[PDB]
């Protein structure tokens, strides 16, 4: 199975979560996919003090648990701070470490101490080669005998890497497709199609093109933020896909992967 | 008065702290400087699980306080979590936000609620124009009537920006000297001479030259990691200046600043 992680940027309300969960039911039911439903309980990095932050740890977790029970979905959420991981892991099947915390050893350790799959997002500032050290920190936490991070050992112990592009001047990200190959020597690689676009004069219309490229290089899965009505989303409305758009991207991924 | 922040990367021992504090005394007594002694109580992005981490918040702050009492030095320390801000500001005159956390709202808020000067390091992934939003979060916490960050308002309310370079391909930082000018419209600017040098060849030799360039452009201060014996430093050794090397550098920057 190829992994598909999909859902809204942030938890906006239980009824929006149900609405997107419903629209994702077809992808969730697809035999070729290992599906996880995603939603952040807090947006720590917003541009303004007034910006919507999410329901927070306790309330957001209750809502995601509701989705898990009503739709039967496995759950992914991100953690930003100490003492969140153990609480979140009771609900979340995957715990994601955000790109800017990708070298934060205490957080890597804390998450790897839970039963969750660890998804480590590559910082836009990182050499892909250097992500091996983040993987090894997680692997040593689960199995102290491990000395070298490799794909099979990382797969076995539930430690994955996620590509979201690299800084390219100011306010531009580029996806170095070579990074998918380099990183996959260390761990299963998920491609983040929605946060890897940013261009001066950002534009989600590139997300499908990058996803197709990525699938052709070789990836273990796809991460894409999706929302039933992006123009009325509370965060990242410009980059998020509608469910129909996501379905096209996934269809193309599967057709490419079925060649190789 | 130009600001000088200097000290070891991490607190190694009380004896090491006193040794470096002693050696910095000529600089601390320089009439032309507003001097702050720096040391980190934890290193969170260390490459290895076994790598030295520091004494931790409680013991770290005790040690910094001993230096303040024994040498009469103002103190800078970095915080990584919101709960640290309150207690650290009882000892530290400046609280620095790490570069990788420069967009973290809750952290910026909690630090700005203290009486400390706030020094916000610019992430190597940021457009310098976008640092105005971090400054504004800090300023609105100190004075809700502020709508836009400017140098004078930031100076008045103890909010500064710190340049540490920008990512330039893999494993390389470049200092865009234009960023010093751009950021100084929003807040006073400190140049970090020692964290902004990295070069993909296999270095501290460039710290002096970048510091002179920054002084010529126009800065409010210098930040530099310094250690009595770099090759025996717990972190890292290759980056830090010896006290004598720092003294020559500060001498050149003051000479340059006196021209303009």
UniProtKB/Swiss-Prot annotation, chain A:
Q: Which domain of life is it from?
A: Bacteria
Cite the NCBIfam families for this sequence.
Answer: KDO8P_synth (TIGR01362), PRK05198.1 (NF003543)
Class in the EC hierarchy, top level = transferase
User: Could you tell me which InterPro entries the record lists for this protein?
Assistant: Aldolase_TIM, DAHP1/KDSA, KDO8P_synthase
Record-linked SUPFAM superfamilies: Aldolase (SSF51569)
Q: What is this protein called?
A: 2-dehydro-3-deoxyphosphooctonate aldolase
Q: Which GO terms describe its biological process?
A: keto-3-deoxy-D-manno-octulosonic acid biosynthetic process
Give one GO term, molecular function aspect. Answer: 3-deoxy-8-phosphooctulonate synthase activity
- Native species of this protein? Helicobacter pylori (strain ATCC 700392 / 26695)
Catalyses which reaction(s): D-arabinose 5-phosphate + phosphoenolpyruvate + H2O = 3-deoxy-alpha-D-manno-2-octulosonate-8-phosphate + phosphate
**Which protein family is named in the record?**
Belongs to the KdsA family.
- Which locations, inside or outside the cell, does it occupy? Cytoplasm
This protein's pathway reads: Carbohydrate biosynthesis; 3-deoxy-D-manno-octulosonate biosynthesis; 3-deoxy-D-manno-octulosonate from D-ribulose 5-phosphate: step 2/3; Bacterial outer membrane biogenesis; lipopolysaccharide biosynthesis
Q: Does the keyword Transferase apply?
A: yes
Q: Which EC number applies?
A: 2.5.1.55
UniProt keyword terms in alphabetical order: Cytoplasm, Lipopolysaccharide biosynthesis, Transferase
An annotated GO cellular component of this protein is:
cytosol
Q: What is its main location?
A: cytoplasm
A Pfam family it matches: DAHP_synth_1
């Amino acid at each position: 199975k190829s992994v598909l992680i999909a859902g809204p940027c942030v938890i906006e309300s239980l009824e929006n979560l149900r609405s997107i969960a419903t629209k994702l039911q077809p992808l969730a039911n697809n035999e070729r996919l290992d599906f996880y439903f995603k939603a952040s309980f807090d947006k720590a990095n917003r541009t303004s003090l007034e910006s919507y932050r999410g329901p927070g740890l306790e309330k957001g977790l209750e809502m995601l648990q509701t989705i898990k029970e009503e739709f039967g979905y496995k759950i992914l959420t991100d953690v930003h701070e100490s003492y969140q991981a153990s609480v979140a892991a009771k609900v979340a099947d995957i715990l994601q470490i955000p790109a800017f915390l990708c070298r934060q050893t205490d957080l890597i350790v804390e998450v790897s101490q839970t039963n969750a799959i660890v998804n480590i997002k590559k910082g836009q500032f990182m050499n892909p080669k250097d992500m091996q050290y983040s993987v090894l920190k997680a692997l040593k936490t689960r199995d102290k005998s491990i000395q070298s991070p490799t794909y099979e050992t990382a797969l076995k112990n539930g430690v994955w890497l996620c590509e979201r592009g690299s800084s390219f001047g100011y306010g531009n990200l580029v996806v170095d497709m070579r990074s998918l190959k380099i990183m996959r020597e260390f761990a299963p690689v998920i491609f983040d199609a929605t946060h890897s676009v940013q261009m001066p004069g950002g534009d989600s219309s590139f997300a499908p093109i990058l996803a197709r490229a990525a699938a052709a290089v070789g990836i273990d899965g796809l991460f894409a933020e999706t929302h039933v009505d992006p123009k009325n989303a509370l965060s990242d409305g410009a980059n998020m896909l509608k469910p129909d758009e996501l379905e096209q991207l996934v269809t193309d991924m599967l057709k490419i992967q079925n060649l190789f």
